[PDB]
């Protein structure tokens, strides 16, 4: 996260770290949506142009964390994956359309003060909250700058940007399964996700029922925190039927 601040303890208890077994490294963010399902970006797992193709056994999820590098004994829970499900129409060739994957944990994780699932939006929540100018929140242990790394989880609040402005900032073909967020160059505030934040949650807090909803997944962007560029996020609600299909069937 660029131009964010340190998270408070327990501020984002659905935050999940995707951690490579060997070598030991941070791969991506992710989020906890129930006691045994984790949501992330498909490109965190499968991206053939960089020869990336991770299987269940290559990865661990670390849940309840705050410090980036410490083993947070008695606080974090580390889980193994049973199965990864990538959206069948994930488009890694052209524009990262439908950049979404589910991961099923080998065993349910117990909830605690530091580990708690985020809600998925229904149609009504998406309709009322996904509006230009409304702010959501991105969290992650990714780089602090495009060209170093944070000691603890970082947080930044960012406004959703109007679709035409998103479209005109890039040569990539934007779809209905994406939205963009960030400040405009004239707005005098900054902030963005960066390398290592991918797959993490873009959340909003409903003013109707006071719950947090995951509206987005950190997907892509050109550099980090560049003027006139915006972060792109997978539109979780547009892909919810696939989510429900996988969870119901498996």
């Amino acid at each position: 996260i660029v131009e964010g601040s340190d998270a408070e303890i327990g501020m984002s208890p659905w935050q999940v770290m995707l951690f490579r077994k060997s070598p030991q490294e941070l791969l991506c963010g992710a989020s906890l949506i129930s006691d045994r399902w984790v949501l992330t970006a498909a490109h965190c797992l499968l991206y053939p142009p960089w020869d990336k193709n991770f299987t269940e056994n290559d990865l661990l999820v670390r849940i309840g964390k705050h410090s980036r590098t410490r083993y947070e004994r008695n606080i974090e829970k580390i889980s193994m994956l049973e199965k990864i499900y990538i959206h069948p129409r994930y488009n890694w060739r052209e524009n990262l359309d439908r950049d979404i994957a589910l991961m099923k944990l080998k065993k349910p994780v117990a909830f605690s003060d530091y580990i708690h699932p985020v809600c998925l939006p229904d149609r009504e929540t998406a309709a009322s909250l996904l509006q230009a100018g409304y702010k959501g929140r991105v969290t992650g242990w990714g780089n602090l700058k495009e060209t170093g790394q944070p000691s603890v989880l970082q947080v930044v609040n960012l406004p959703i940007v109007e679709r035409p402005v998103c479209k005109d900032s890039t040569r990539i073909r934007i779809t209905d399964n994406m939205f963009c967020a960030g400040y405009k160059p004239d707005e005098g505030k900054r902030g963005d996700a960066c390398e290592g934040d991918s797959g993490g949650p873009f959340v909003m807090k409903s003013p109707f029922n006071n719950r947090w909803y995951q509206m987005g997944i950190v997907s892509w962007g050109e550099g980090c925190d560049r003027d006139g560029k915006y972060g792109f996020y997978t539109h979780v609600f547009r892909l919810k039927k696939w989510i429900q299909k996988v969870i119901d069937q498996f």
Binding site: S22, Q24, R70
Partner: peptide, 10 residues
């Protein structure tokens, strides 16, 4: 710079 995690997970 990652601290080692318990052996069983690796």
């Amino acid at each position: 710079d990652f601290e080692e995690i318990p052996e069983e997970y690796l």
